[PDB]
Each structure stands twice: as C-alpha cells, then as structure tokens.
C-alpha cells in the first residue's frame, strides 16, 4: 500500500497495459521511463528554450565542427558504477552498430567521439546541424554500456526490459493492467551533487479508459496531475476548485499548430492561388469559440507556437506583409480570376473547364472536436462556392491516407509540436523527400515541391540558435514560401492539457509563476514534469 | 465485498455517520430504514397523487368519521412473527402513550382504533381530518408491536435499534462511517404476495463530504442513483454521459417552492402594498437563468409546485385575476402612493414621515446560490427605490430567525415540499398559531395574521381530497389571500435533484418513462424510490 501523502497520481499519456521500459524506444516505453529512471545530458524548458545542465554540467561548440560535453562530477548508476563519458559515447555508437535504432541518422553527418577522460565527450562532426542536435540533447537518454554493450539488435530493440538499470531520481517499483510505480531512489546521485529532490515518495502512472474516469478521480481528488484532453474547462474551474495554467481564456497552454494539409498533386489544389482562396475562406473563431470553449488559440498565418522558443525567431515583417486572413468576399473574387466558376446554378464553383468539384475535408471518426471543426470548415467553404464534405474514416486509414497523400484536405497535428527549433514546424509542413517516398511519415503529406525550401531547409539546419538575426531571416524566407503557396493551412493551437488540484500536492505551476513545462508523455518529462516533481510541496 | 454488479450505490442524503435505525424518529434515522425496512400502509406516488396498496390492501371512509384499512394476507416481520391489525393499531395507541413520538397529535382528533380482525382496522374519529390523515396514510412507518411493547419512553424516542426488525425487502447488514449496507430479505413477504423484488442484492447509502466527491463518483460510474445537487447540469449531460429526468430545461422536477417571507409584524414590511411593491420589483428570470442554468422552473404566483397533485386543484381564474407579476413601474406607482418618497435626494425612499428604510434579506451563510438569489434581488429592489442589503448568518442563527420571526424579508423553503395536499402548502404560508408561540416551527414565520385563514384552512383540512370542486374553490380562496396580502412571495421551485449513470443498472425513472418519483431522502422511499428498486435492469 502506499501513503496516500508520498503518492503523486500522474495521468494521460498511458493509454495500454505497462509492458515496455526499453530506453532505446522512449515513446514507447512506460511514461516516465525515461526522465525517471533514464536521465538526458540536459534538461530543456519549451517555455523559453532554456537548456540546463543535468549529466552534462557544461556543453557548447568549441569550433563549427566541435562540440564538448563534460559531465557532472560523482554520478552513478544505480548499482553503483559510475556514469562516465564511455556511457554517452556508447549510446551514440551503439546506433551506429544497430542502425535500426531511432538516432542512428546522427552518424550519416557525426564523424566520431572521443573521450579524453571520464567527464569529457568530444563530438567531431562532418557536417554540423545544428538545430538537429539541439533536439538530440535533450530527447536521447543515456544508457548503461556495462548492461547494453553486449546484447544483440533484438535484444536492444524489442526487450521489455523489466526493472530498467537508470541512473535517475526513481526505480520502477512495481505495475499491472491499470497503473505503473515508481519509487524514490533514496541514493540518487542527483540528490548529492544538484541539491534537488522529488517530492513523492512514489509516481504512480494512472490508466484510464475513459475521459469519465479520468475526470471523476480528479474530482474525488484521487490524480493529482492530469495531461487528460477534458472538455468543459470554464465550469469546471468556476465551480469545481479545478486549476489549469490561466485563469481565463485559453486556460492551457498551446503545444501543436492544428491547419490543413492539403494535396499539392491534385487539381485543383495543386493550384496555389486556389488554397489561397480555401485559407481566406476560413474562420477559426467559431471553432476557438463554439467547439473548444476558448481554450484553445486561433493561430497566427504563420502558426508559430506562443509560449515557445519558435517566437525568439518570429518573422514579423513577412507575416504582415504576406499573411493571410478570413476574407470570403476576396476568396470568391480570387476564384472568379481563376477561372473556378458557378456554370450549372447549382451554387458550387466548376473547374475552368466545366467539371463539378467536391472535396473531401478528414479527420479519425471519433476524434470529435476535430470532426465539428471540419463540418465548420466545410460550411465555410460552401459559403465561398466551394463544394466540400467532411470524411471520417478510423484512424488506421487517416493515417495510411496521411503517409501516402491520398486525401484532398486534410486537418493535422502530426510534427507540429513544440521544440527547440522552428526548423521541426518547417521541416514538418514541407519534407522534400515526401516527394520521392511512398510513405511520408516525417511531413509535406500533401506532396508540396518548391525549388528553395529544401536548400532553406538545410541553411536554417546548419545556422547557430545563437545567431538569431540570421535563423530569423531563414525562418523569414520558409514562412514567405508559407503563406505565398500554402501547402499547409495554420488555423488553430492544440492545447497543452494541464489539470491539477492541491488536497495532496501544491505548487504546481501556472502562469503566475511558469518555472515548467507541465508534460507528462512518454520521454517529456526532462522538459518541465521532472522539474515540478523537485518543487511540490505537500498540502496542509 | 460486495459484487458490484448485484449492488446499487445511492447518494444525497446522508451527511453524518450512520448511527441510528429507530423508526419513531424516521427522518433521522439512517436513509432507507423507513422504506426498506420498515414498510408503510401505502405507497404514494408526488408524481400523480396516487395512492398504492402496500401493508394495506385498501383503504377507504366507510363514511365521514371511520377509515377502514384491510391488510393484505401474508404479510410478516422477518423473525416471522405475522404482521396483524395490532400492530398497526399499536403503532397509532403507542404515541398516545408517548406523546413525545412525532404524530401524537392525531389523538387530538382520532377516537380509538378497532380490529375485529387480525387483517382490518377501523380508525373512528371525532374530528376526522382529511388532508392531515392522507399524509399520515403514507409516511408512518408500521412498527412491530412484539418488539416494542414493553420498552419505556427514552428506548422508544432515542434508543439507536441497530439491526433493525421489520417486515420490508431488506435488512440492515453493515455500516462505517462513510456508508450504510442494506441486504435483501430473500424470504420478504411482498415478493410472495405483491410478486415484486429489488433488483439489488445490495442497496448502499453513500455518504461524501463534499460535492466534488460526489460528482466525482458518478463520473467514475461508483455512484448509480444520486440526490446531490450538482451544478453544472448542461455540460455534464452535453459531454459526460449523465442524465437528468428531462432532456432540457429545467432538467429536474420540481420538490419545493422557494420564497420571501416578510416580516408582517415590522414596518413598513406591515403594510401589504409595500409588500406587493416588492413582489412586483422581483424578476426571478436572471436567477432561473444566470443562477441556475435552467436547472429550475420559475413559480407561477400561487407558487403551486408543477408535477405534483396541488395542480389538480389549481384556481386558475383565481390567479389570473390576483397574481402579480415583474413590473418594477407599478411598483413605483405603487409606493408613490403608499407616501414611500425619497425625501433626501439618495435615491432611496423614506417612510411617509422621512426616515430611512433599508431592509435585510437573508438565507444561511453558503448557500451559494441562495446568496447569488439574495443580490439579484437586492440590486433589483434598489431599481425601484428601495435600499436593501444581503445578511448571510450562520445556518444556526438563520433557523433561529426563522422560528422566531426575527428578520425583514428572508429566503425560505421551509414545508413548501411536494405533499399530497396543497393543505401543507397554505399551511406552511399561512400557520395561525405562529402569532401565539415564541417560536414557529411549522410555518408563517413573519407572524401576518388574518381572520379569515384559519377558518379556511380548518375547512379545507376537513374536506375530503375526492371533493375536487371543494378543494379547488378553498385553495382559491385562500390563493386570494395570498395573492392580495403577500405574506410570502413565491419565486421559483427547487429542484428534486435526480443524476443517474447506466453502467451496472437501467431502466430508471425519466420523463419519458415517469414511473416513480426518484427520492431517497430518509423517510421517502415509500413515495418512489423503492418502486425504481423493484423495476431497475441490470446493464449489459
Ligand atoms: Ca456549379
Ligand atoms: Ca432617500
């Protein structure tokens, strides 16, 4: 039994049995896995884009092609042998090794690591990307070379790795159907030499099946940290002492750019000038209103992430000059020049040859903010003369459609989170090598080619995130590109959803005083839910 | 531990540990002690004024001064001791002795009880009293004379009767200090004789500290059949799956009148048109509708409550003549001519010799929507000229208020509770004998005295309630009353909060299936809720 007061109720993002805590596979892996029990070189804060030091105690560029990481002083596994710079150079080389592994990319522009002692890491780079390894830093754990160094690919890969050796603030403690535990490794090195501790005594991973249930246990005050996606947020919080980051409107923070892929291969929208139109046509202010409840904000034209580091980089002449906004008298005067005409009364535009135009706007049946959104749009659309349906297919296909091209509008979130870099939102909407795939899984599902995003692509990549005038200026050249051909269509911010309640725990944060990105998922917690376990303190 | 699929889980009514199970005191003792352990003659339903054969066979005044009830056969306690005429004439003679018991006043006015039989029993009168004994028929528990026979006066008022012997449906099985465990009775007389049975092994009364717990636990599909009042009712039924009896508004029936009684005895609260003025000031529609989200009916000005079997004799050429309504000019019309002026320039009217007038409205102290009521209606009264303040005493100093009509104007619901008679109604207005007694428990607690009422009372107490055309002319008379003096302002109805969840058991009450009223306060299962027992499926 554990002590309701030492216990932390942690839930939303584990949706399936406990049954993976491989590092080598952190979003698969139970939630916490990795940040409780795998540590990163650094802590990373989306809020401001703040790294700070956690196994490394320094890390920077020494030349354009050097960077040197040192390690903190006395840190150990929890069987007691030293993490040292043998144990960060064997979970790069490891990918070399077994390419299957997630990072193994790293090694097509990383030339070697060397190890002068057993604090330093020295990385020598054939060719630096540097917004890439911005994003490695604090999303790769480092792993054991005494326990890995011997396993083979299936092994590394695939084992469930029960009771997983870590060098972090918790052990795994014990799991069945519904929940995962976590207890306090009492001889945490981190404890010795950063000064910090967690809070509880035990994390408990809480599964649900049901927005319900989730709901009800924060009400009977039985989850103290909720990533839960709860509709109803203004009553809840008017009448039901429920906390969220703002006290008003829009309630959470914002952690994806929601819009509009749309099919660059397909006519009409092949045509830019037509997702112009389609773009104008669109009012978000009913769907941030009527089916979110305001807790959700309406995105800028160029859909870059407030509360992010993506802003340090905002191009804010270009998207004044070039961005787009609902205007459905311009968009019916844009398709009249183009030639997209009403020729047989029935309301609808036909092509400039004649032929009837209806498309098909999807989101997964059952995602059913989404489906309102799109029956929103599909009347919007209408409005201008552009005969829309909206298509729910399950999830399996919307995401086959998504990998393939094969839609016509298609709403998405998928690599639009937050990061350390636009260059991910970038590299998201306009992936060249979609263009040469079958199946797309990292962006441009709509199959949008440009001449100079793909050499942008690679300038922003390997500029510093210190030399902000030019990573604006670059930011500046993609978002032009953006919002002249609009292959993707930014319409509204997904929500960071955070709901806590203080009868056991308190100090979370909000945004009087935002010290921590409130992010429970799988491999999230070293960017702010590690960092809030440090400064809970226990209720009256 | 109970399977949770043959246990029925209710909540609403039990706000202190379960402690006493005596049937003497049957508001006090646990909830479902009357009703499932102790049965009445009759079941009655608030819905339709029927009244259903339970001890009782039938029931019937073989003329104006003699009631005659036939028991069924069959019926017995559950240590199998026949269930006869003498206990129900030892549950009547036993108050005789014992004044004390809470219905010894009926010896004021009933004879003696014969039983020529062990099944009939012959209640002859000297003052037969119609609409008092229709209430009795229903809420006194019948209790078992073999047991009680020779117990002295404090065992009978006070003694705790753990493991309660009756002749009901269930037995008393287990307790703590958060619930209440009731077991069916499998060899229950009624399932042999009346051919029903409780769906439920097991009827649990749940008791929670607050509504957020209770909310909680409907969520968490832990709570079947809730009497919690719960606001919130709109976007819990939109988005969580939680019905009400109505689909829309008002989403509950309606169980009490909620009104102002005034301070007859105080001026200028002494004079009926100021009285009228202050009704007329009143709109109830922003308290209806920004207090309460819909959740309850505005009253009509008798304030006879809907769904209830007051409206069948409801005098509507009466209230159509009399009735008042929100008309703030006429009510400064009204108090112009009264001498009521504003003599100081504050915009605040004096008195006819120019003092200052500012009244105290008041309910208890957190109450929260009754204070929200009060400010409503105390910026409303300001409109039209006359200053008054919200008082929020403790619920202690409230009630003692109340008794001793020691307030201006004062928020009450207090006996305006759905009844089979709207003789509880006037009564609770208009109880004469509040002007000779220190305190008034019963009612007309603002001490307005007419010559006319308690002559109109006394004779529609000795009406018979089959006398429509009677009834109906006297409830006109004294809504005339009413209607013309203003005592006590109606306003709008409370709701009988009702929320239910269909995850182990279905098929409950609604509006589309009106079958039982849905109370399980203590002492009010016989009026529905054990009828929703006896007729719950469970779920699949
Ligand atoms: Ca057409
Ligand atoms: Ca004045």
Same mark, same amino acid.
């Given at each position: 039994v554990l002590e309701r007061n030492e216990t932390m109720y942690y839930?939303?993002?584990?949706?399936?049995?406990?049954?993976?805590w491989?590092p080598?596979?952190?979003?698969?892996?139970v939630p916490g896995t990795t940040g409780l029990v795998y540590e990163t070189?650094?802590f990373?804060?989306?809020?401001?884009?703040?790294?700070?030091?956690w196994l490394?105690?320094?890390?920077?560029?020494?030349?354009?092609?050097?960077?040197?990481?040192?390690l903190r002083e006395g840190i150990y596994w929890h069987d007691n042998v030293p993490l040292?710079?043998?144990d960060?150079?064997?979970?790069?080389?490891?990918?070399?090794?077994?390419?299957?592994?997630?990072?193994?990319?790293?090694?097509?522009?990383?030339?070697?690591?060397?190890?002068?002692?057993?604090?330093?890491?020295?990385?020598?780079?054939?060719?630096?990307?540097?917004?890439?390894?911005?994003?490695?830093?604090?999303?790769?754990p480092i792993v054991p070379?005494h326990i890995?160094?011997?396993?083979?690919?299936?092994?590394?890969?695939?084992?469930?790795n029960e009771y997983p050796l870590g060098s972090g603030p918790y052990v795994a403690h014990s799991w069945?159907?519904?929940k995962m535990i976590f207890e306090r490794f009492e001889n945490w090195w981190g404890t010795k030499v950063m000064g910090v501790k967690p809070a509880p005594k035990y994390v408990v991973i809480?599964?649900?099946?049901?927005?319900?249930?989730?709901?009800? %246990?924060?009400?009977?005050?039985?989850?103290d940290f909720?990533?839960? %996606?709860?509709?109803?947020?203004?009553?809840?919080?008017?009448?039901?002492?429920?906390?969220?980051?703002?006290?008003?409107?829009?309630?959470?923070?914002?952690?994806?750019?929601?819009?509009?892929?749309?099919?660059?291969?397909?006519?009409?929208?092949?045509?830019?000038?037509?997702?112009?139109?389609?773009? %104008?046509?669109?009012?978000?202010?009913?769907?941030?209103?009527?089916?979110?409840?305001?807790?959700?904000?309406?995105?800028?034209?160029?859909?870059?992430?407030?509360?992010?580091?993506?802003?340090?980089?905002?191009?804010?002449?270009?998207?004044?000059?070039?961005?787009?906004?609902?205007?459905?008298?311009?968009?019916?005067?844009?398709?009249?020049? &183009?030639?997209?005409?009403?020729?047989?009364?029935?309301?609808?535009?036909?092509?400039?040859?004649?032929?009837?135009?209806?498309?098909?706007?999807?989101?997964?049946?059952?995602?059913?903010?989404?489906?309102?959104?799109?029956?929103?749009?599909?009347?919007?659309?209408?409005?201008?003369?552009?005969?829309?349906?909206?298509?729910?297919?399950?999830?399996?296909?919307?995401?086959?459609?998504?990998?393939?091209?094969?839609?016509?509008?298609?709403?998405?979130?998928?690599?639009?989170?937050?990061?350390?870099?636009?260059?991910?939102?970038?590299?998201?909407?306009?992936?060249?090598?979609? &263009?040469?795939?079958?199946?797309?899984?990292?962006?441009?599902?709509?199959?949008?080619?440009?001449?100079?995003?793909?050499?942008?692509?690679?300038?922003?990549?390997?500029?510093?995130?210190?030399?902000?005038?030019?990573?604006?200026?670059?930011?500046?050249?993609?978002?032009?590109?953006?919002?002249?051909?609009?292959?993707?269509?930014?319409?509204?911010?997904?929500?960071?959803?955070?709901?806590?309640?203080?009868?056991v725990w308190?100090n979370?944060?909000?945004?009087?005083?935002?010290?921590?990105?409130?992010?429970?998922?799988?491999?999230?917690w070293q960017?702010?839910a590690l960092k809030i376990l440090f400064n809970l303190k226990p209720?009256?």
């Amino acid at each position: 039994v554990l002590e309701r007061n030492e216990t932390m109720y942690y839930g939303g993002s584990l949706w399936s049995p406990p049954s993976n805590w491989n590092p080598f596979t952190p979003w698969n892996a139970v939630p916490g896995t990795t940040g409780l029990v795998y540590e990163t070189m650094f802590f990373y804060d989306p809020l401001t884009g703040n790294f700070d030091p956690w196994l490394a105690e320094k890390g920077e560029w020494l030349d354009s092609k050097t960077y040197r990481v040192v390690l903190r002083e006395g840190i150990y596994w929890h069987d007691n042998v030293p993490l040292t710079s043998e144990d960060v150079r064997f979970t790069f080389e490891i990918a070399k090794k077994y390419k299957g592994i997630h990072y193994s990319s790293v090694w097509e522009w990383l030339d070697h690591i060397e190890t002068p002692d057993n604090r330093t890491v020295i990385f020598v780079f054939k060719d630096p990307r540097y917004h890439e390894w911005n994003e490695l830093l604090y999303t790769l754990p480092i792993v054991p070379k005494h326990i890995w160094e011997e396993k083979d690919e299936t092994t590394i890969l695939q084992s469930s790795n029960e009771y997983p050796l870590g060098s972090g603030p918790y052990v795994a403690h014990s799991w069945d159907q519904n929940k995962m535990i976590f207890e306090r490794f009492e001889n945490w090195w981190g404890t010795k030499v950063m000064g910090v501790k967690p809070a509880p005594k035990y994390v408990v991973i809480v599964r649900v099946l049901s927005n319900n249930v989730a709901l009800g %246990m924060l009400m009977k005050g039985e989850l103290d940290f909720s990533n839960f %996606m709860l509709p109803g947020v203004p009553i809840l919080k008017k009448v039901y002492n429920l906390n969220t980051w703002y006290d008003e409107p829009p309630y959470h923070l914002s952690s994806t750019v929601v819009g509009l892929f749309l099919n660059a291969r397909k006519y009409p929208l092949s045509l830019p000038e037509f997702r112009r139109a389609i773009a %104008m046509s669109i009012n978000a202010d009913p769907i941030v209103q009527r089916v979110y409840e305001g807790a959700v904000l309406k995105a800028d034209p160029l859909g870059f992430l407030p509360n992010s580091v993506w802003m340090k980089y905002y191009p804010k002449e270009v998207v004044e000059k070039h961005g787009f906004k609902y205007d459905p008298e311009e968009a019916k005067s844009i398709l009249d020049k &183009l030639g997209f005409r009403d020729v047989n009364g029935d309301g609808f535009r036909e092509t400039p040859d004649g032929k009837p135009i209806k498309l098909t706007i999807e989101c997964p049946y059952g995602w059913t903010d989404w489906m309102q959104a799109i029956q929103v749009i599909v009347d919007q659309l209408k409005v201008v003369g552009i005969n829309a349906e909206p298509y729910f297919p399950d999830s399996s296909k919307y995401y086959e459609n998504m990998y393939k091209g094969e839609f016509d509008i298609e709403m998405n979130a998928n690599g639009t989170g937050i990061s350390s870099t636009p260059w991910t939102y970038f590299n998201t909407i306009f992936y060249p090598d979609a &263009l040469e795939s079958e199946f797309s899984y990292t962006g441009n599902y709509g199959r949008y080619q440009n001449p100079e995003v793909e050499s942008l692509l690679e300038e922003l990549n390997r500029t510093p995130l210190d030399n902000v005038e030019k990573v604006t200026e670059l930011c500046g050249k993609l978002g032009e590109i953006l919002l002249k051909d609009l292959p993707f269509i930014p319409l509204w911010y997904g929500a960071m959803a955070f709901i806590t309640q203080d009868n056991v725990w308190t100090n979370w944060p909000n945004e009087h005083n935002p010290y921590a990105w409130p992010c429970g998922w799988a491999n999230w917690w070293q960017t702010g839910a590690l960092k809030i376990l440090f400064n809970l303190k226990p209720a009256k």
